[PDB]
Amino acid sequence: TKCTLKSFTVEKGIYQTSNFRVQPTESIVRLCPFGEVFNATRFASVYAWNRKRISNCVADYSVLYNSASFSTFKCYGVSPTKLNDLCFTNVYADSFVIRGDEVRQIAPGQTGKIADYNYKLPDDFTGCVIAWNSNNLDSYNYLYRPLQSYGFQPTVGYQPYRVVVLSFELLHAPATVCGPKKSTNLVKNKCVNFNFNGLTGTGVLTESNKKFLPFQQFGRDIADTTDAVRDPQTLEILDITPCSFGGVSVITPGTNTSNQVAVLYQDVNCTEVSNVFQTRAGCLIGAEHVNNSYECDIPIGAGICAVASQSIIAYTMSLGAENSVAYSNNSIAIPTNFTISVTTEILPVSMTKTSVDCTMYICGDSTECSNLLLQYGSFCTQLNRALTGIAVEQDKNTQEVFAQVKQIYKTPP
Amino acid sequence: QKFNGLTVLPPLLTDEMIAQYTSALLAGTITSGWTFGAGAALQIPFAMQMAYRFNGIGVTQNVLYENQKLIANQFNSAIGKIQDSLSSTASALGKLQDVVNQNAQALNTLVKQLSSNFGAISSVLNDILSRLDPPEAEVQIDRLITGRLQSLQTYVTQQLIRAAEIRASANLAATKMSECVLGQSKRVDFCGKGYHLMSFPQSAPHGVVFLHVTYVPAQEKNFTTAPAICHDGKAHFP
Amino acid sequence: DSTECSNLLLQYGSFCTQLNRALTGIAVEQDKNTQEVFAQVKQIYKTPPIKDFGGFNFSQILPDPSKRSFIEDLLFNKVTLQKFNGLTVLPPLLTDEMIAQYTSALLAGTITSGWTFGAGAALQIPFAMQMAYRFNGIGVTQNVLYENQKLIANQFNSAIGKIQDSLSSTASALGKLQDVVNQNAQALNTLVKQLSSNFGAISSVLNDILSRLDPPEAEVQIDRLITGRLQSLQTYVTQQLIRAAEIRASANLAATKMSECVLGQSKRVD
Amino acid sequence: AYTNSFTRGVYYPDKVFRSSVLHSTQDLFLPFFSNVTWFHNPVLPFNDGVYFASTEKSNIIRGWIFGTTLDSKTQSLLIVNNATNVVIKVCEFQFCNDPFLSEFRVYSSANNCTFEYVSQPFLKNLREFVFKNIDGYFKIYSKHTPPQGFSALEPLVDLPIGINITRFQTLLAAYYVGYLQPRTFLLKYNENGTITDAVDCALDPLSE
């Protein structure tokens, strides 16, 4: 608080220095028939390469990437690992059988009998070019380009290989195929970080009470403030409440009076972060709780105020001495003496007549800068004038309160 | 304070000049009481003026004369307490000190904002301009201007709101002086506690301090009463 | 709770500190408006156990230890008394069942002790004699009260029972109090709604813009949301300062009326 | 042959849940008290979504045909009710002068057909539907009611189709047809989270 006040001596009273919050813990997280592409019984010739458009599914791309079912695995644009985190409009796959040495030709920027007359790729990116050895299950029943057949003999560069080329459609239409959403288990009664399939916020997840209907994923109560959400993968309804947070203030009798300080947390259950005590206003730590009552010294809230006998104390403030005037309808109390007294009452009637130069305040001694200020018109003039209009009436207040005497009387000697 | 396009205007009425009004004021209310604030001043002996002011509350004039010595003693020993209450107790003028602190804080916050970046490459206008061609420089400058303008707009808005609050305070202070200094207030609990008798303004740098002299009962006894008394079949009301 | 957004806040300097302090001053001021109006008595006077105030019925005016006074209970039945993030509410210094102890003290003085209770030492006086003086002050000779006391007490009592029915059976009789509650709620509700505002950005949610954009372009989009939301916050505080000033004026008048009309007998007309 | 759609045509604009609160949103809704055309098998302009209703307890109403040209020239939807399942395709069927629907002679061709989906069947008794195109996502709205009164139309499916639908000649007992317009409404959400009332923000000076 010395810091947030920028002083080495902070005075008596209550000061706010920062906020606090419960940090989120243990975050939680809320199929395309590729078998007929890579595990197909038969593939066609390269000159008549076939293609199928794969769409409308959630596709897990690690199955054919992290295991060695292929001899060639080369992807472009996106590293092969991250395909499971991306959505695409469409996926196309080309399939054919070729010779081994001819595998290097299935790429952009290639030349040869295959690249030029059998299967040509555009000068662009390609999802993944994947190939595997196939002489174990296939090997003159394949043709290449006018056309020629392949002498695939079972007895490496001349062996048959099955090639699948994946091509993705990007942002042409709403995405129809993406990878999986590797959800995790959920927790309860704890502030957590959540990611509810497109919703990333914080709070405490508990079993909800309000009933949804079959076509609601989540709900709100006012201004997009999500209250409860049905989990799409487990089909349960849970409520959201923010994890307790708030302001923290300190109570001091003064820096040169005593370094003893108590900390006040506002609006929380003091189950969690010397002395510990609860109030209607938040729990106090370091202030000893007394029973009897006194005049409010350092206010806290909800009727509780807070040094006495070299320690801090909190108490409910007394309103005043409780006396009961004895009412009688046959008797009256009257003064039989009097005490004349004096009383000081302080009232401000002025402030310092502030005046600020806008063109110097914003730019000052710069012609080029002020050239841009002119594009904001009269802002300075209205602001300059507004300040002039207060400084003018400050002289009036002093004139109005004090100058009420027709002339200047003198005290007789 | 005021060091880069900021200033403070001097007051029209200086401290030595205001202290002449308050000397003129309470040199009247000693010599003439409520009269001088209506028309021509009328010199009235002080004790006579006080005796009337007692009558203005509801205590018979003679009470003051019979106890004139005691009243003067209590009055003086009361004024001396103010001299000493103020001379040692800090935060005596906290209400007055607050306005000064608020003004100072507003000025210091505004000045500090000159070092804010506002998303620019640099917080200082001289450096951005000194190393960027006008095209790119104006873009970086425009961010700075918008920020600084918003900071100034914030200042002037709060200053007007604070000014409005002072105006109400000034109106009250002016009002209190007219009825409590240039006259004798009848409304209760307005010019200090108790039954209002007299008051005097005292100067202050940014405000006005009043010393309110009031009559307060004490040392009271129990008596039996009767709405009226009956004598020869008639009710005698006081 | 966005680290990247925060970096884009420090560049604006003390903006948040200034706004925070402004809302602190009013909140401290609000605790003073209640201390300055209700706390007019240094002691807590109590209604005598036996109640013989010359025939004037006070039972619906004074607290009933069953629960505040009957009328107060009715008042709390005619008014219609949220925060999610960054927003909170502070409790008042003086709670409801604490303020009702100032009123039930200021009201137990004016009845028993006349106007001296809040002038100097309280002076017990029979109520009828107190009323007789009050009639004198208006400019009606004291004896009028005594001769007609039985009629005056009846009119007084039948008049109190009218308000109890006027209040309870006629709604919207506390429009002045409901507006303040309603306007406060409207200010907070509007401020919350602004979080969904786009302000020309790609998207209104900070978590989504950042999650799919590189820091370069992301900051440009983020800067737009911050500028917008910052203005929405400054607007709220500005309105609260102006509104608070009006409440202060009301609170100041309430204190004056209580001092002159409750703690004594005002003579000014209307 | 027009009729009056008193307050029909309200639907749940999103999957949000509300309770005992009045939300005022804006979307393609059927204006209240509008002129609804009561047909008793023409092609109808689509024009930014279409409210559909029918009370005819008959299987004659069997499905629809959404597309641009409704021929082999363009993909089109043969949304049909197969009386055990709802069957949807977007295959490039060719035009049929009058495709009946107990025989079926609508699916004449399937050239470069790209999307097929099936689900549970929809199935005196007034059925209401709303079909809207939005940013390529094709949604479908429905309800089942035993045409005076008020109700709400729940969603069934969103289809990420991305096609141009300008003609929706229903296949073939009467059916109403309306058109949607960008109207702001004040939807009243009950405690149960259902919609129980609505205000048409441009119908009357009062509703304004």
Ligand SMILES: *[C@@H]1O[C@H](CO)[C@@H](O[C@@H]2O[C@H](CO)[C@@H](O)[C@H](O)[C@H]2NC(C)=O)[C@H](O)[C@H]1NC(C)=O
């Ligand atoms: C006037 O008489 C009443 C009642 O005798 C006094 O009130 C009581 O005074 C006694 C002694 O001070 C207290 O112990 C009681 O608590 C008071 N209340 C009662 C008994 O009702 C009253 O103090 C007398 N007035 C003065 C100032 O002497």
Ligand SMILES: *[C@@H]1O[C@H](CO)[C@@H](O[C@@H]2O[C@H](CO)[C@@H](O)[C@H](O)[C@H]2NC(C)=O)[C@H](O)[C@H]1NC(C)=O
């Ligand atoms: C009223 O109270 C005042 C309080 O000052 C009394 O004045 C004091 O009286 C005592 C006893 O005679 C003296 O010892 C003091 O010196 C007096 N003080 C002053 C400042 O004069 C006064 O006597 C009281 N009068 C009555 C009638 O009770």
Ligand SMILES: *[C@@H]1O[C@H](CO)[C@@H](O[C@@H]2O[C@H](CO)[C@@H](O)[C@H](O)[C@H]2NC(C)=O)[C@H](O)[C@H]1NC(C)=O
């Ligand atoms: C003062 O007025 C109250 C008005 O409520 C009286 O309380 C009522 O008395 C009537 C009969 O006279 C009962 O029917 C009500 O039930 C009472 N109200 C209650 C108990 O809340 C009270 O009796 C009056 N007292 C005096 C002394 O006049």
Ligand SMILES: *[C@@H]1O[C@H](CO)[C@@H](O[C@@H]2O[C@H](CO)[C@@H](O)[C@H](O)[C@H]2NC(C)=O)[C@H](O)[C@H]1NC(C)=O
């Ligand atoms: C003055 O007015 C009061 C009430 O306004 C009258 O008192 C009433 O007396 C009449 C007849 O005696 C009754 O019918 C009313 O019900 C009484 N009202 C109350 C509240 O007591 C009174 O009679 C009038 N005249 C005088 C001379 O006082």
Ligand SMILES: *[C@@H]1O[C@H](CO)[C@@H](O)[C@H](O)[C@H]1NC(C)=O
């Ligand atoms: C092909 O079949 C083998 C053996 O059953 C299996 O390990 C492999 O994963 C299958 N490929 C696909 C794409 O399912």
Ligand SMILES: *[C@@H]1O[C@H](CO)[C@@H](O)[C@H](O)[C@H]1NC(C)=O
């Ligand atoms: C602290 O300093 C202030 C001002 O110098 C003084 O009034 C106060 O009594 C000091 N407190 C102590 C414990 O010395």
Ligand SMILES: *[C@@H]1O[C@H](CO)[C@@H](O)[C@H](O)[C@H]1NC(C)=O
């Ligand atoms: C804190 O929560 C626990 C469990 O819900 C409850 O028993 C306790 O009373 C709460 N504390 C306060 C101050 O409400």
Ligand SMILES: *[C@@H]1O[C@H](CO)[C@@H](O)[C@H](O)[C@H]1NC(C)=O
């Ligand atoms: C405070 O009062 C409570 C009343 O229940 C009592 O239990 C407790 O021991 C008291 N403590 C002190 C220090 O007076």
Ligand SMILES: *[C@@H]1O[C@H](CO)[C@@H](O)[C@H](O)[C@H]1NC(C)=O
């Ligand atoms: C409709 O249902 C029948 C039997 O339930 C089934 O044989 C047929 O394949 C389905 N689909 C049609 C007719 O398009």
Ligand SMILES: *[C@@H]1O[C@H](CO)[C@@H](O)[C@H](O)[C@H]1NC(C)=O
């Ligand atoms: C098939 O039709 C779709 C829809 O218009 C179109 O995008 C695609 O290019 C067509 N492909 C072929 C091979 O006809």
Ligand SMILES: *[C@@H]1O[C@H](CO)[C@@H](O)[C@H](O)[C@H]1NC(C)=O
């Ligand atoms: C719909 O038709 C218009 C005709 O101008 C065309 O420009 C637009 O791209 C078409 N939309 C789709 C999704 O084919």
Ligand SMILES: *[C@@H]1O[C@H](CO)[C@@H](O)[C@H](O)[C@H]1NC(C)=O
């Ligand atoms: C729906 O609301 C009604 C009336 O508020 C209530 O009785 C019922 O329990 C709630 N739940 C449902 C869906 O029945």
